[PDB]
């Protein structure tokens, strides 16, 4: 997170940290004791599928205090429309092997109803993005969970304000931009998969997933988030399905 602050211990109770063989993979959000949402590209190169773990209650990556819980990830489900290597349909729904326990340091973020999201949350200006990713582009990742408040933009305004090229894909209806164009704040590498949470009348909801961008805090650029409102149907239907016998599952989308 570039230009953020430290999320005081416990103020980001839904934050998940995915690890592959002990190494940081991506961030994730907790929607309920056994389901976690992340970004699909985070699994583009996973060949040690049974070495994938999720940590909750995590704050300070160096020391260990009581509060952390680790569970293995039993299944990873990504849209059938995602293409390894791209940024569209960048969502992954993970089924933990056993549930986590909720405590003051482990609480899920509400997954909102599509209409409420599209119609009300989408117009809340600021949401928080968080993680243990780089603190500057190509900089050092963090140790204490960092959080940043970013303003959201409608694509017309994003396309209008962003500078023409770079390895920048299009902004599809499955993405949205939030951030600053003056290169002061943004999400970055290591934050990918993590949350974009919106606060509406006392509760927090999951509106986006950290997905991609031109560098991190690149001038004339904004951060791009997976628009979760477009997958709620899909998520809910999957979280009510019966376990099917694969670790990586590509589920039909729509």
């Amino acid at each position: 997170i570039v230009g953020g602050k430290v999320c005081p211990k416990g103020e980001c109770p839904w934050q998940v940290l995915l690890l592959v063989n002990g190494a940081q993979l991506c961030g994730g959000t907790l929607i309920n004791t056994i389901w976690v949402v992340s970004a699909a590209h985070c699994f583009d190169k996973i060949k040690n599928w049974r070495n994938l773990i999720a940590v909750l209650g995590e704050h300070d990556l160096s020391e260990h205090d009581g509060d952390e819980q680790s569970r293995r990830v039993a299944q990873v489900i990504i849209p059938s429309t995602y293409v390894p290597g791209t940024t569209n349909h960048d969502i992954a729904l993970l089924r933990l092997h056993q549930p986590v326990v909720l405590t003051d340091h482990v609480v899920p973020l509400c997954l909102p109803e599509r209409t409420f999201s599209e119609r009300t949350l989408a117009f809340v200006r600021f949401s928080l993005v968080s993680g243990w990713g780089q603190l500057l582009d190509r900089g050092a990742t963090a140790l204490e969970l960092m959080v940043l408040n970013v303003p959201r933009l409608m694509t017309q305004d994003c396309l209008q304000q962003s500078r023409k090229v770079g390895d920048s894909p299009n902004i599809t209806e499955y993405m949205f931009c939030a951030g600053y164009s003056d290169g002061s704040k943004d999400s970055c590498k290591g934050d990918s998969g993590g949350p974009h949470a919106t606060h509406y009348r006392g509760t927090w909801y999951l509106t986006g997933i950290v997905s991609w961008g031109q560098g991190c805090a690149t001038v004339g650029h904004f951060g791009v988030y997976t628009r979760v409102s477009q997958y709620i149907e899909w998520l809910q239907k999957l979280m009510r399905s019966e376990p099917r016998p694969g670790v990586l599952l590509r589920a039909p989308f729509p």
Binding site: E11, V107, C110
Partner: protein, 96 residues
Amino acid sequence: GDQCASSPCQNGGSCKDQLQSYICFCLPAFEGRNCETHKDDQLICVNENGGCEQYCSDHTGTKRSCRCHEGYSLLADGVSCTPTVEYPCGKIPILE
């Protein structure tokens, strides 16, 4: 309407004449150039979430209904939700 002369300000507003133009000083419940819109008649879900704390549903020829997320129950007022669980989602326990 025409400037003041033709009492353009509806629903109890007062007109003020300007350089041809006029201004209508509407009453608390109406707004609009000519105090024509009733603030009290736009209880729809696209209008400040219908006043619902969490979910809103609009209904044909009948008032909109507010709802809640799993773990929450709708209260008497018809708009607010309270948690019916320990760790209701989207709540931060140390800030509660």
